[PDB]
Amino acid sequence: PPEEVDVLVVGAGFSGLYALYRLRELGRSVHVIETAGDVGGVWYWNRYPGARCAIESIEYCYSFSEEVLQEWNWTERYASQPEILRYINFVADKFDLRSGITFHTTVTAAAFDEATNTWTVDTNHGDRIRARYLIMASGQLSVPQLPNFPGLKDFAGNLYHTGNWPHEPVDFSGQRVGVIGTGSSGIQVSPQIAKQAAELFVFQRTPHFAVPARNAPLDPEFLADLKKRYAEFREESRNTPGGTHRYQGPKSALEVSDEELVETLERYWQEGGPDILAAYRDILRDRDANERVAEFIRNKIRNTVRDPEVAERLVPKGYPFGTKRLILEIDYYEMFNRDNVHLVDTLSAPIETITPRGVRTSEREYELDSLVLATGFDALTGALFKIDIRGVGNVALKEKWAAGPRTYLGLSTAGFPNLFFIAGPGSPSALSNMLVSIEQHVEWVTDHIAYMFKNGLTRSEAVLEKEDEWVEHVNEIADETLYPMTASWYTGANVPGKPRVFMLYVGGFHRYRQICDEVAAKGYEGFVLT
Ligand SMILES: Cc1cc2nc3c(=O)[nH]c(=O)nc-3n(C[C@H](O)[C@H](O)[C@H](O)COP(=O)(O)OP(=O)(O)OC[C@H]3O[C@@H](n4cnc5c(N)ncnc54)[C@H](O)[C@@H]3O)c2cc1C
Ligand SMILES: NC(=O)c1ccc[n+]([C@@H]2O[C@H](COP(=O)([O-])OP(=O)(O)OC[C@H]3O[C@@H](n4cnc5c(N)ncnc54)[C@H](OP(=O)(O)O)[C@@H]3O)[C@@H](O)[C@H]2O)c1
């Protein structure tokens, strides 16, 4: 890795690879540092069986390259992780991206030097790079989180986390296997494992809402047709709250009769996918509205499993539909109908400790040959906090953000000039199709950088007052929805001791992009440039 560079980029997943590509195109020196052996980010790390995207392949893809759009052939309604990894390798090879990337290398600290207006960045290999701009493309869901209980290191069997899955197939044949966590990771990994294991124990805490994916082959007519209008189709997706073609249902879940509700929701349930989140305009705004939808979903869940005792344990309760990430399930509910699959309800009987033989609840011991941790991620701030980042006056990012992330547009933080966060806290981030949130942040940041070199500036900084205004705005629009009142990773609720604040912008990607454009249009209002 070079000793000096215009822009250093941390992370080689979607965000990082695009930042590299566009920056070269703008004629800036740029280099990328990445912990992993190769490119991919989440689709490199998350190789557990059943790993699949929950945005339709034709939406969840880059649009910066008409060539890539014309050449790539997706195959399924929802792409499996290995296909998305092939796609990302395709794009990397096409634009020759690896010559710009150092792999196997973890950034450990970065400190801003006020005299030079530059960042000096250090790695666990002892490299030191001096860069004018520092782009953290280091992910949202990139640091695995272990669950909160002892005896983990004592377990005699094999121990896995889904976000750090082995690079070659793991064989569960004839095993007694435990999965802890039933987020989308656990929901995807579990039916795969149940095919091999002599017995599978699924350790559920709060149940998550899941609806049928109804995956299907992609019609190759449809692909070829779509391509003729691809750039147009994408543009429609950029002009939405969600970054996809999801239908924005006009009515209120409350204005309709029961019969019309069932019938409309029945159509979504048969169709499959996440679009039901926008069946009515107020599902995420009004608790009575939300509840009518949630109830319809709970009953479909009940009717999915024959033992009604086991079915009632699968019904999510205590939090509004859609306020933890919606999950797309494939034969997950069906799975509890098998002899060798066991739902362990750890709300009724909490896990007390892992033992050398298995798992202890307050009710009994569970002997196991392997334990799979589907326990999620220290989300949104996790990766940043693992790095000793220091701004003006030696302030640690970790400390300034200790009560929750403070940003302007989520893009930068006051006190830390020349530093940009891709698709993180204070922006749409994971509340969209992330390829659309990711391209828009990469273009805005890399445009900002180009504008800086153009007009002769060397220092970009969020104005503290606008940040404070932005933080309060994010919180106040979040408080008009039901989002903040549920314990989700959006809220930091899954890391012990982490401050409970809703971390994402909820006003929709479209409106967020309009605001960013007005900002850059006025020469970057809310930034101070010198
Ligand atoms: C299992 C899973 C499924 C998902 N499914 C969807 C989906 O269906 N729809 C959707 O819109 N989004 C989904 N997401 C969200 C996902 O975060 C984004 O879609 C997108 O892949 C994020 O890309 P990225 O480049 O920003 O971050 P990442 O892909 O996470 O890349 C960050 C990279 O930075 C590296 N890194 C972090 N810190 C350092 C450091 N200190 N030094 C060097 N390298 C570092 C990591 O190794 C990683 O490779 C999913 C995420 C996960 C984990
Ligand atoms: N496209 C996809 O289908 C897909 C697949 C995987 C991941 N993702 C992305 O990644 C996000 C995270 O998914 P995820 O399933 O990995 O993690 P998650 O949504 O954060 O779920 C973690 C799970 O582990 C359980 N858990 C956590 N801590 C525990 C503890 N201390 N004791 C007992 N149980 C514990 C949680 O229970 P509680 O809920 O009760 O806390 C939850 O069931 C998703 O929401 C999505 O954004 C997407």
XYZ file of C-alpha atoms and ligand atoms in Angstrom:
631
model
C 0.000 0.000 0.000
C 1.282 3.472 -1.002
C 2.790 5.878 1.501
C 0.628 8.757 0.428
C -2.712 8.943 -1.377
C -5.516 11.416 -2.135
C -8.210 9.141 -0.651
C -7.917 6.108 1.569
C -10.897 3.779 1.533
C -11.525 1.222 4.294
C -13.505 -1.896 3.213
C -13.779 -3.884 -0.057
C -17.501 -4.690 -0.206
C -19.995 -3.001 -2.515
C -19.261 0.461 -0.994
C -15.470 0.277 -1.042
C -15.146 -1.235 -4.544
C -17.316 1.468 -6.030
C -15.536 4.239 -4.207
C -12.267 2.950 -5.679
C -13.720 2.722 -9.168
C -15.358 6.133 -9.273
C -12.363 7.914 -7.642
C -9.935 6.574 -10.317
C -12.478 7.754 -12.935
C -12.335 11.220 -11.371
C -8.550 11.008 -11.641
C -7.673 10.863 -7.928
C -5.125 8.502 -6.414
C -7.071 6.083 -4.181
C -6.307 2.793 -2.422
C -8.437 0.382 -0.367
C -7.462 -1.565 2.787
C -9.528 -4.715 3.611
C -9.239 -7.352 6.410
C -10.592 -10.267 4.282
C -8.647 -12.372 1.768
C -10.753 -11.111 -1.120
C -13.552 -8.672 -2.250
C -17.193 -8.993 -1.284
C -17.718 -7.643 2.222
C -20.814 -9.316 3.649
C -21.033 -11.780 0.653
C -17.445 -12.861 1.310
C -17.887 -13.336 5.062
C -21.474 -14.673 5.196
C -21.060 -18.098 3.517
C -23.302 -20.062 5.781
C -25.703 -22.384 3.849
C -28.965 -20.732 2.853
C -27.421 -17.200 2.823
C -29.545 -15.270 0.338
C -30.464 -11.659 -0.348
C -33.907 -10.307 0.573
C -34.015 -7.668 -2.255
C -34.758 -9.002 -5.784
C -31.690 -9.692 -7.794
C -32.659 -7.193 -10.450
C -32.854 -4.408 -7.809
C -29.898 -5.455 -5.688
C -27.063 -4.732 -8.184
C -24.871 -1.848 -9.343
C -26.228 0.634 -11.916
C -23.144 2.807 -12.435
C -22.153 0.666 -15.492
C -24.557 0.132 -18.464
C -22.127 -2.582 -19.612
C -22.461 -4.575 -16.330
C -26.274 -4.151 -16.476
C -26.355 -5.520 -20.080
C -23.938 -8.396 -19.524
C -24.803 -9.858 -16.091
C -27.512 -12.522 -16.043
C -29.261 -12.977 -12.641
C -31.027 -16.351 -12.268
C -33.411 -16.218 -9.317
C -35.948 -13.837 -7.838
C -33.588 -13.570 -4.776
C -29.831 -14.200 -5.295
C -28.013 -16.741 -3.065
C -24.776 -15.566 -1.449
C -22.486 -17.501 -3.818
C -24.100 -15.948 -6.918
C -23.740 -12.446 -5.443
C -20.140 -13.242 -4.703
C -19.661 -14.306 -8.390
C -21.272 -10.981 -9.411
C -18.973 -8.922 -7.230
C -15.948 -10.863 -8.629
C -17.215 -10.125 -12.118
C -17.401 -6.432 -11.456
C -13.976 -6.372 -9.734
C -12.276 -8.122 -12.647
C -13.995 -5.881 -15.230
C -12.572 -2.619 -13.785
C -9.348 -4.121 -12.517
C -10.007 -3.199 -8.877
C -7.663 -5.427 -6.946
C -4.513 -3.585 -8.075
C -6.010 -0.811 -5.889
C -6.622 -3.020 -2.797
C -4.468 -4.363 0.088
C -6.020 -7.541 1.569
C -5.485 -9.453 4.815
C -4.901 -6.100 6.484
C -6.890 -4.455 9.279
C -6.894 -0.690 9.822
C -6.237 -0.118 13.599
C -6.107 3.709 14.079
C -6.506 6.898 12.170
C -5.694 10.379 13.372
C -6.334 13.695 11.752
C -3.303 16.086 11.538
C -4.613 19.689 11.781
C -1.462 21.391 10.438
C -1.411 19.269 7.216
C -5.181 18.801 6.846
C -4.570 15.046 6.284
C -5.295 11.630 7.968
C -2.564 9.244 8.961
C -3.856 5.656 8.978
C -2.271 2.616 10.596
C -2.670 -1.130 10.150
C -2.042 -4.353 12.109
C 0.761 -4.951 9.620
C 2.483 -1.698 10.682
C 1.738 0.165 7.423
C 1.189 3.873 7.810
C -0.594 5.771 5.036
C -0.992 9.553 4.766
C -4.234 10.524 2.949
C -6.133 13.755 2.392
C -9.539 12.027 2.706
C -10.626 8.989 4.627
C -13.637 7.036 3.523
C -15.000 4.445 5.907
C -16.717 1.939 3.642
C -16.405 -0.589 6.500
C -20.022 -1.779 6.588
C -23.129 -1.777 8.655
C -23.319 -5.401 9.667
C -19.637 -6.270 9.655
C -18.592 -7.140 13.269
C -20.147 -10.376 14.548
C -21.699 -10.176 17.997
C -21.563 -13.133 20.404
C -24.526 -13.756 22.689
C -24.416 -12.615 26.378
C -23.762 -15.753 28.464
C -20.737 -17.655 29.938
C -19.121 -21.052 29.214
C -18.830 -20.384 25.518
C -15.098 -21.184 25.485
C -15.881 -24.298 27.467
C -18.014 -25.960 24.787
C -16.374 -29.299 23.752
C -17.938 -29.395 20.195
C -17.552 -27.153 17.089
C -18.588 -23.523 17.424
C -19.598 -21.302 14.535
C -20.851 -17.746 13.860
C -22.822 -17.242 10.615
C -20.922 -13.962 9.865
C -17.552 -15.725 10.101
C -18.558 -19.002 8.394
C -15.793 -21.484 7.275
C -14.666 -21.117 3.611
C -15.389 -24.754 2.884
C -18.647 -26.759 3.564
C -19.343 -27.834 7.151
C -20.909 -31.218 7.560
C -23.566 -31.592 10.195
C -24.491 -35.209 9.228
C -25.870 -37.249 12.079
C -25.217 -34.401 14.609
C -27.150 -32.916 17.486
C -27.049 -29.252 16.476
C -28.029 -25.983 18.140
C -28.772 -22.697 16.472
C -28.996 -19.684 18.777
C -30.628 -16.689 17.098
C -33.653 -16.614 14.821
C -33.006 -13.381 12.950
C -32.733 -13.743 9.204
C -29.372 -15.480 9.573
C -30.897 -18.189 11.849
C -33.968 -18.423 9.693
C -31.889 -19.031 6.576
C -29.265 -21.277 8.140
C -31.718 -23.464 10.089
C -33.637 -25.382 7.318
C -30.273 -26.159 5.637
C -28.819 -27.665 8.837
C -32.012 -29.590 9.509
C -31.370 -31.579 6.344
C -28.169 -33.119 7.820
C -28.494 -33.117 11.588
C -29.843 -36.101 13.526
C -31.423 -33.510 15.794
C -31.705 -29.718 15.493
C -32.425 -27.421 18.413
C -33.502 -23.925 17.623
C -32.976 -21.553 20.517
C -35.385 -18.653 19.923
C -35.668 -15.645 22.193
C -37.995 -12.969 20.869
C -39.617 -14.376 17.760
C -39.119 -12.334 14.535
C -41.773 -11.752 11.948
C -41.086 -13.680 8.764
C -43.136 -13.961 5.503
C -42.632 -16.477 2.634
C -39.938 -15.490 0.176
C -41.598 -17.418 -2.709
C -38.318 -17.513 -4.578
C -38.545 -18.622 -8.234
C -36.422 -18.826 -11.341
C -36.097 -15.597 -13.181
C -37.884 -15.676 -16.546
C -35.163 -15.104 -19.219
C -37.712 -13.212 -21.303
C -38.287 -10.828 -18.505
C -34.462 -10.313 -18.053
C -33.912 -9.544 -21.788
C -36.980 -7.228 -21.833
C -35.837 -5.395 -18.640
C -32.415 -4.791 -20.020
C -33.908 -2.752 -22.885
C -35.061 -0.195 -20.287
C -32.596 -0.945 -17.428
C -31.253 2.559 -16.738
C -34.857 3.783 -16.779
C -36.058 1.016 -14.415
C -33.212 1.828 -11.905
C -34.091 5.503 -11.985
C -37.643 4.671 -10.986
C -36.160 2.749 -7.969
C -34.018 5.765 -6.918
C -37.141 7.840 -6.714
C -38.760 5.890 -3.915
C -38.654 5.723 -0.095
C -37.245 2.165 -0.318
C -34.929 2.036 -3.319
C -37.135 -0.630 -5.053
C -40.343 -1.026 -7.119
C -42.394 -1.789 -4.018
C -45.921 -0.537 -4.355
C -46.628 2.441 -2.092
C -50.113 1.482 -0.904
C -52.330 4.683 -0.729
C -54.818 3.733 2.052
C -54.709 3.384 5.840
C -54.656 0.020 7.433
C -57.474 1.463 9.579
C -59.914 2.795 6.936
C -60.517 -0.712 5.464
C -62.935 -3.385 6.637
C -61.585 -6.630 8.044
C -62.529 -8.496 4.892
C -60.711 -6.055 2.599
C -57.656 -6.195 4.910
C -57.442 -10.014 4.786
C -57.923 -10.004 1.073
C -55.246 -7.383 0.331
C -52.765 -9.023 2.776
C -53.606 -12.457 1.338
C -52.459 -11.224 -2.071
C -49.063 -10.091 -0.580
C -48.653 -13.316 1.356
C -49.186 -15.429 -1.811
C -46.962 -13.140 -3.841
C -44.106 -13.374 -1.332
C -41.408 -10.854 -0.430
C -41.139 -7.700 1.740
C -43.559 -5.416 -0.199
C -46.324 -6.009 2.313
C -44.385 -3.497 4.533
C -45.958 -0.834 2.303
C -49.384 -2.425 1.835
C -50.890 0.580 3.716
C -49.302 4.045 4.203
C -49.395 3.910 8.068
C -48.252 0.400 9.072
C -45.003 1.880 10.470
C -46.714 5.021 11.909
C -49.777 4.027 13.837
C -49.976 1.332 16.388
C -53.582 0.305 15.748
C -52.930 0.112 12.028
C -49.769 -1.871 12.576
C -51.540 -4.218 14.930
C -54.248 -5.227 12.379
C -51.482 -6.223 9.953
C -49.425 -7.846 12.644
C -52.449 -9.911 13.718
C -53.034 -11.120 10.199
C -49.424 -12.265 10.012
C -49.513 -13.997 13.425
C -52.489 -16.103 12.273
C -50.712 -17.213 9.070
C -47.768 -18.231 11.259
C -50.090 -20.256 13.585
C -51.661 -22.083 10.661
C -48.204 -23.042 9.331
C -47.282 -25.626 11.945
C -49.512 -28.553 13.062
C -48.756 -28.808 16.770
C -50.543 -25.604 17.982
C -48.384 -25.460 21.053
C -45.238 -25.229 18.903
C -46.978 -22.834 16.514
C -47.928 -20.434 19.284
C -44.247 -20.220 20.305
C -43.335 -18.969 16.859
C -45.805 -16.035 16.998
C -43.907 -12.778 17.551
C -45.297 -10.646 20.434
C -44.514 -7.437 22.283
C -43.303 -5.156 19.469
C -44.813 -3.760 16.253
C -44.605 -5.505 12.885
C -41.796 -4.158 10.785
C -39.823 -2.561 13.613
C -37.310 -5.407 13.664
C -36.091 -6.060 10.033
C -38.749 -8.081 8.106
C -37.462 -11.605 7.314
C -38.139 -13.619 4.155
C -38.396 -17.306 5.088
C -37.972 -20.441 2.900
C -39.328 -23.613 4.497
C -38.484 -22.338 7.914
C -41.920 -22.599 9.480
C -42.571 -25.848 7.626
C -39.385 -27.134 9.312
C -40.948 -27.328 12.777
C -43.243 -30.035 11.370
C -40.246 -32.430 11.238
C -39.404 -35.076 13.966
C -35.866 -34.083 14.301
C -36.411 -30.318 14.778
C -36.991 -28.788 18.184
C -38.044 -25.203 19.070
C -36.531 -24.215 22.407
C -38.416 -21.143 23.760
C -35.783 -19.258 25.814
C -38.188 -16.495 26.824
C -39.928 -19.082 28.995
C -36.684 -20.736 29.897
C -33.659 -18.403 29.492
C -30.237 -19.722 28.742
C -28.253 -19.844 31.921
C -24.849 -20.952 30.460
C -23.181 -23.021 27.700
C -21.720 -26.290 29.159
C -19.031 -28.580 27.680
C -21.814 -30.823 26.427
C -24.331 -28.224 25.230
C -26.698 -25.570 26.418
C -28.269 -24.976 29.792
C -31.656 -23.373 30.181
C -33.510 -22.856 33.503
C -35.506 -26.006 32.476
C -32.896 -28.562 31.234
C -29.602 -29.411 29.649
C -29.275 -29.869 25.833
C -26.393 -32.015 24.728
C -24.817 -30.964 21.358
C -22.072 -31.829 18.911
C -22.148 -28.345 17.316
C -23.376 -24.890 18.172
C -24.190 -22.285 15.493
C -24.283 -18.637 16.574
C -26.784 -16.691 14.518
C -26.427 -13.868 17.088
C -26.065 -10.918 14.717
C -23.723 -7.976 14.581
C -22.564 -5.050 16.617
C -24.341 -2.955 13.990
C -23.690 0.442 12.383
C -20.997 1.763 14.816
C -19.288 -1.610 15.583
C -16.721 -1.557 12.824
C -15.854 2.127 13.361
C -15.439 1.613 17.115
C -12.939 -1.162 16.563
C -10.619 1.501 15.056
C -8.884 4.181 17.128
C -10.186 7.184 15.190
C -9.120 10.659 16.490
C -10.165 14.122 15.288
C -9.375 17.739 16.103
C -8.191 18.142 19.751
C -7.512 14.406 19.950
C -11.221 13.572 20.491
C -11.891 9.809 20.053
C -14.769 9.011 17.692
C -15.661 6.201 20.107
C -16.142 8.775 22.910
C -17.929 11.515 20.938
C -20.381 8.847 19.845
C -20.758 7.142 23.229
C -24.384 8.347 23.654
C -25.111 7.265 20.045
C -23.864 8.408 16.612
C -23.726 12.154 15.956
C -23.401 13.160 12.285
C -24.383 15.662 9.610
C -26.394 13.714 6.968
C -24.752 10.645 8.456
C -22.032 11.470 6.013
C -19.543 13.182 8.397
C -19.048 14.289 11.983
C -17.989 17.734 13.242
C -14.500 17.744 14.784
C -13.422 15.106 12.266
C -12.828 16.862 8.970
C -12.113 14.954 5.671
C -13.881 11.822 6.958
C -16.854 10.171 5.333
C -19.022 7.269 6.380
C -20.713 5.202 3.658
C -24.298 4.190 4.218
C -24.126 4.399 8.001
C -25.909 6.009 10.978
C -27.917 9.188 10.365
C -28.697 8.179 6.699
C -31.151 5.721 5.021
C -28.538 2.953 5.277
C -30.118 -0.478 5.847
C -33.664 0.900 5.733
C -33.354 0.793 1.937
C -32.195 -1.488 -0.799
C -28.634 -0.915 0.133
C -27.223 -0.800 -3.392
C -29.215 2.414 -4.042
C -28.246 4.008 -0.647
C -24.638 2.917 -1.283
C -24.326 4.291 -4.871
C -25.835 7.640 -3.846
C -23.419 8.088 -0.844
C -20.411 6.970 -2.875
C -21.337 9.460 -5.680
C -22.021 12.384 -3.257
C -18.775 11.815 -1.305
C -16.624 11.225 -4.419
C -18.295 14.334 -6.076
C -17.498 16.295 -2.870
C -13.897 15.175 -3.075
C -13.679 16.152 -6.724
C -15.235 19.555 -5.981
C -12.599 20.079 -3.234
C -9.628 19.370 -5.568
C -11.311 21.426 -8.338
C -11.747 24.699 -6.309
C -8.385 24.351 -4.467
C -9.663 23.473 -0.997
C -8.013 20.961 1.347
C -10.323 20.755 4.374
C -13.940 19.696 4.661
C -15.921 19.796 7.967
C -19.377 19.443 9.268
C -20.555 22.509 11.188
C -21.327 21.488 14.746
C -24.652 23.344 14.835
C -25.997 21.616 11.651
C -24.949 18.175 13.059
C -26.859 18.949 16.220
C -29.782 20.041 14.065
C -29.411 16.917 11.931
C -29.227 14.586 14.992
C -32.349 16.128 16.450
C -34.164 15.942 13.078
C -33.330 12.186 12.684
C -34.640 11.621 16.210
C -37.737 13.658 15.785
C -38.807 11.964 12.493
C -37.947 8.571 13.997
C -40.296 9.464 16.912
C -43.238 9.886 14.525
C -42.838 6.129 13.652
C -43.023 3.021 15.717
C -39.359 2.205 15.059
C -37.731 3.643 18.273
C -39.807 1.741 20.657
C -38.517 -1.688 19.770
C -35.354 -3.343 20.865
C -33.603 -4.080 17.486
C -30.021 -3.737 16.201
C -31.238 -0.463 14.580
C -31.454 0.692 18.169
C -28.173 -0.893 19.361
C -30.275 -3.095 21.649
C -28.355 -6.240 20.823
C -24.964 -5.080 22.250
C -24.993 -5.126 26.173
C -24.583 -1.575 27.460
C -24.809 0.124 24.060
C -27.033 3.245 24.124
C -30.624 2.640 22.939
C -31.098 5.269 20.187
C -32.684 4.638 16.760
C -29.704 5.138 14.504
C -31.177 5.448 10.992
C -32.807 8.162 8.932
C -36.470 7.144 8.299
C -37.701 9.783 5.875
C -37.059 7.563 2.794
C -34.121 7.425 0.422
C -35.773 9.724 -2.211
C -36.273 12.656 0.257
C -32.819 11.999 1.727
C -31.252 12.267 -1.719
C -33.089 15.537 -2.534
C -31.651 17.037 0.703
C -28.137 15.884 -0.121
C -28.488 17.356 -3.620
C -29.666 20.770 -2.305
C -26.691 20.688 0.073
C -24.123 20.061 -2.704
C -26.050 22.457 -5.029
C -25.396 25.414 -2.691
C -21.677 24.522 -2.524
C -22.075 22.220 0.530
C -24.190 24.109 3.013
C -23.526 22.879 6.584
C -19.894 22.164 5.759
C -16.987 24.561 6.190
C -14.480 24.395 3.377
C -10.916 25.821 3.401
C -26.000 -11.676 5.869
C -26.397 -10.316 5.304
C -27.448 -10.199 4.383
C -27.840 -8.954 3.891
N -28.906 -8.864 2.995
C -29.223 -7.629 2.513
C -30.276 -7.532 1.642
O -30.980 -8.512 1.362
N -30.615 -6.281 1.205
C -29.879 -5.141 1.493
O -30.210 -4.065 0.987
N -28.790 -5.218 2.334
C -28.510 -6.464 2.895
N -27.481 -6.549 3.781
C -26.716 -5.301 4.168
C -25.313 -5.190 3.612
O -24.596 -4.544 4.642
C -25.326 -4.312 2.360
O -26.305 -4.729 1.453
C -24.002 -4.231 1.637
O -23.569 -5.545 1.336
C -23.005 -3.489 2.528
O -21.841 -3.238 1.788
P -20.633 -2.358 2.332
O -19.435 -2.286 1.370
O -21.105 -1.060 2.835
O -20.141 -3.125 3.682
P -19.553 -4.648 3.813
O -20.036 -5.596 2.752
O -19.871 -5.132 5.216
O -18.000 -4.399 3.642
C -17.176 -3.860 4.664
C -15.825 -4.509 4.596
O -14.895 -3.772 5.378
C -14.056 -4.618 6.077
N -13.582 -3.901 7.279
C -14.264 -3.440 8.372
N -13.391 -2.826 9.215
C -12.165 -2.877 8.657
C -10.914 -2.433 9.090
N -10.784 -1.875 10.303
N -9.815 -2.650 8.275
C -9.944 -3.293 7.051
N -11.192 -3.749 6.644
C -12.273 -3.535 7.437
C -14.858 -5.879 6.280
O -14.008 -6.992 6.289
C -15.809 -5.929 5.074
O -15.269 -6.729 4.031
C -27.134 -7.802 4.280
C -26.072 -7.928 5.173
C -25.736 -9.171 5.720
C -24.584 -9.260 6.718
N -31.145 -10.859 3.234
C -31.219 -11.605 4.360
O -32.094 -12.439 4.404
C -30.330 -11.467 5.538
C -29.709 -12.586 6.168
C -28.876 -12.364 7.309
C -28.668 -11.043 7.737
N -29.249 -9.975 7.096
C -29.057 -8.575 7.574
O -28.320 -8.655 8.817
C -29.222 -8.269 9.907
C -28.923 -9.131 11.156
O -29.464 -10.433 10.879
P -29.104 -11.560 11.969
O -30.133 -12.720 11.923
O -27.684 -12.012 11.733
O -28.935 -10.949 13.461
P -30.179 -10.274 14.273
O -31.240 -9.814 13.355
O -29.369 -9.092 15.021
O -30.725 -11.428 15.165
C -29.797 -11.904 16.151
C -30.598 -13.063 16.778
O -29.810 -13.653 17.830
C -30.586 -13.645 19.041
N -29.726 -13.210 20.155
C -28.904 -12.103 20.150
N -28.313 -11.979 21.339
C -28.739 -12.996 22.175
C -28.469 -13.334 23.532
N -27.585 -12.532 24.278
N -29.091 -14.432 24.044
C -29.949 -15.127 23.274
N -30.230 -14.816 21.989
C -29.635 -13.802 21.421
C -31.570 -12.425 18.894
O -32.635 -12.621 19.853
P -33.603 -11.307 20.209
O -34.247 -10.742 18.831
O -34.761 -11.637 21.116
O -32.572 -10.116 20.549
C -31.945 -12.690 17.426
O -32.785 -13.844 17.444
C -30.614 -8.564 9.348
O -31.617 -7.917 10.109
C -30.472 -7.993 7.933
O -30.340 -6.587 7.954
C -30.080 -10.173 6.047
